[PDB]
Amino acid sequence: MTITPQNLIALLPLLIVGLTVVVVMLSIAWRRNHFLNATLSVIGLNAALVSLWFVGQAGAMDVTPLMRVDGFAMLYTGLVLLASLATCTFAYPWLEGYNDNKDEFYLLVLIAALGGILLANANHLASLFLGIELISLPLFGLVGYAFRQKRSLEASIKYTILSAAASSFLLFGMALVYAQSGDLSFVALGKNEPLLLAGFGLMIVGLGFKLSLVPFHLWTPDVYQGAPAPVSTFLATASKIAIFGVVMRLFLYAPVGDSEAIRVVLAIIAFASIIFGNLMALSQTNIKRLLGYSSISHLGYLLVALIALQTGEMSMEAVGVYLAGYLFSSLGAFGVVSLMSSPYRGPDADSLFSYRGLFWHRPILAAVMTVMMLSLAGIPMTLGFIGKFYVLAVGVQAHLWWLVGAVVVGSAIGLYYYLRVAVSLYLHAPNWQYSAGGIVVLISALLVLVLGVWPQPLISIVRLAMP
C-alpha cells in the first residue's frame, strides 16, 4: 500500500526521532557544543513522548507489510523512550569530565532509540532485523565510548564479536524458516516439519544472546563492568525491553509457536536461566557485575510468563507490568551508580566493598538504591512484587509447576545478595544537571513505592494498551 496520513500519524514515533538525529548531526557540525546537543536530543525524545498521544488517536492498523501498529506497541515505545530520556540525563554528569569529543554520545543514543521503537512495531521478519541492528550499532560503539581505559575497549570488543555472531545466527535461522513457508511475515509463517523447527531454533540462539539467556549470558557481566554507567542504564533497560516485545509477538502470531516442540525448549532455557543466574550471582563484590547477574534472572521470569502466553489471556498484562516494574527498578539503581561518578574520574571505582557507608556520605541517594534494590527482589510495597505475583499466577494458570517452583527457589536464592547491598549502605564509613540526575532517580523512587502499595492505576494503563 501507499502512504496515507493515517500511516504518517501511526509512524510519528519513528519520525520525530529520525528528524532529531538529523538536527543533532547538523548541530554537531555547526558548533560542536555539549549543552546544545544535550538540549536538542532530549527535546526530540520528549517530543516523541508527546506524539505517543497522537498515535493513540489512531487505531490498531498497519503501515507497511513490515510493521503492525497496535496499542501493545504504544506501551513498548514508551518504555524505550523513558530509558533513552533516562540515559541522556545520566550521561551529562559523567561526560562533563570527559576530555574531548563529548558530543557523539547523544547521536548514538538517538540511533538506538530508533532501533528500539522499530522493534516495538513488528509484523515481518525483516523489521525484526532492521531493529536489532539499529540498536546494536550504538551499543557496539557506546560501550567503547571513552576507549581511553583499558577495559572499555575490552568490553566493546567482546560485545562486538559476540553480537555480530548472534546476528549471523539469527539471519541464518530467519532464512531456513522461509524455505518452507512462502513468506517471512509473522502471521503468514507456519501456514511441525523439522526444517521450520530447526530454523526456529537458530532464531532462538540469535535472540537469546541479546536477551541474556542461559547458554548465551557470558557477555552480561563483562561489558557491564567495562561500559560507562550511563551506557549501562541503556544497556540494562532499553535494549532488552525493546527486544522482548518482538520475541513475544512472534510466538503470539505464529502458529508454529503453538506447538509443544518449541515450548519445551524455551521452558528449559527459562528454568536454567533462573538457576544459572541466581546461583552465580551470590559471590560478586562488584555492583555492576551484580546488576548484570540479576538481569539474567529477570529475563528468565519474563520467559516463564511467555511460555504460558498461549494458555490464558492474563500473560499479556503480566509481561507488560513486569517490564514496567523492571524498568523503574534498574533505572533507579544504575542511576545511583552513575551519580556516584559525578566526574569522569577515569575508571570509576565502584564495588560492594566500596559501598560501605554511603548513608552518612549521601543519605537520599542511599535510600533510592535501597528502595530499588528491595524492589528487584520481591519485597512488597514495591512494584517488583506485583510483577512477580503475576508471573507466579501465570505459571499456576498454565500448570507449569517446575517453572513456578524455580521462580520461588530462585527468589529464595536471590534474596541473599540484594539484601547485602541494602545493608552495606549502612555500615560505618571507610552541578545543575547533577541535581537533575538526582531528580530522575528520586522521581523513580517515589513511583516504585506508590505503585507497589497502590498498583491499580498501572494495570489500567496496561489493559488500555493491550489488544
Partner 1 sequence: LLKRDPLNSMMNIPAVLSRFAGKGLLLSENGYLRWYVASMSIGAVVVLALLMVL
Partner 2 sequence: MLLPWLILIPFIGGFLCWQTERFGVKVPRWIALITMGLTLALSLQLWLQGGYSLTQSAGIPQWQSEFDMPWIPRFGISIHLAIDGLSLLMVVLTGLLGVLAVLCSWKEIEKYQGFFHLNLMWILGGVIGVFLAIDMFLFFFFWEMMLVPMYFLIALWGHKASDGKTRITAATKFFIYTQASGLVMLIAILALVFVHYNATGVWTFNYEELLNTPMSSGVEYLLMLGFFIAFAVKMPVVPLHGWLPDAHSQAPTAGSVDLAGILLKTAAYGLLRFSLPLFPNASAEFAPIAMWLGVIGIFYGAWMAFAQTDIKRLIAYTSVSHMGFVLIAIYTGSQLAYQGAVIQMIAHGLSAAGLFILCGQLYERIHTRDMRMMGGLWSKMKWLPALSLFFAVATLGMPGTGNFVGEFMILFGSFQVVPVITVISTFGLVFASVYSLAMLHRAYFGKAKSQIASQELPGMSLRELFMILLLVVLLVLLGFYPQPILDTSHSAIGNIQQWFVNSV
Catalog residues that contact partner 1 under the rule CB under 8 A.
Answer: 157-158, 161-162, 165-166, 169, 194, 197-198, 200-202, 204-205, 208-209, 215-216, 218-219, 221-222, 260-262, 264-265, 268, 276, 279-283, 413
> Restricting to residues 379-408, which ones interact with partner 2 according to CB under 8 A?
379-381, 389, 392-393, 396-397, 404, 408
- The CB-of-283 to partner 1 minimum distance in angstroms stands at 5
Q: How many residues belong to the site for partner 2 (CB under 8 A)?
A: 27
From the list partner 1, partner 2, none, partner contacted by residue 443 (C-beta under 5 to 8 A by kind): none
In the complex with partner 2, the residue whose CB is nearer, 243 or 386, is 386
Which residues contact residue 249 at a Cβ distance below 8 angstroms, ignoring those fewer than 6 apart?
A: 72, 122, 186
Stretch that binds partner 2, among 247-255, 326-334, 343-351, 377-385 (CB under 8 A): 377-385
- The CB-of-335 to partner 2 minimum distance in angstroms stands at 23
From the list partner 2, partner 1, none, partner contacted by residue 232 (C-beta under 5 to 8 A by kind): none
Sign of CA dihedral 391, 136, 84, 66: negative
- The CB-of-288 to partner 2 minimum distance in angstroms stands at 22
From the list partner 2, partner 1, none, partner contacted by residue 187 (C-beta under 5 to 8 A by kind): none
From the list partner 2, partner 1, none, partner contacted by residue 419 (C-beta under 5 to 8 A by kind): partner 2
Q: Residue 195: helix, strand or coil by DSSP?
A: helix
- Of the residues 427, 439, 446, 464, which one makes contact with partner 2 according to CB under 8 A: 427
- The CB-of-436 to partner 1 minimum distance in angstroms stands at 37
For residue 305, give Cα distances in angstroms to 9, 70, 175, 254.
32, 21, 28, 17
Give the burial class of 459: count Cβ atoms within 10 A of its Cβ; 0-12 exposed, 13-18 middle, 19 or more buried.
Answer: middle
Q: What is the C-alpha separation between 376 and 395, in angstroms, rounded?
A: 20
The 3-state secondary structure of 203-258, one letter per residue = HHHHHHCCCCCHHHCCHHHHHHHHCCHHHHHHHHHHHHHHHHHHHHHHHHHCHHHH
Supply the angle between the helices 12-30 and 104-119 in degrees, to the nearest 10.
Answer: 170
In the complex with partner 1, the residue whose CB is nearer, 414 or 437, is 414
Q: What is the C-alpha separation between 42 and 106, in angstroms, rounded?
A: 9
Q: Does 358 bind partner 2 (CB under 8 A)?
A: no
- The CB-of-183 to partner 1 minimum distance in angstroms stands at 22
From the list partner 2, partner 1, none, partner contacted by residue 408 (C-beta under 5 to 8 A by kind): partner 2
Q: Residue 444: helix, strand or coil by DSSP?
A: helix
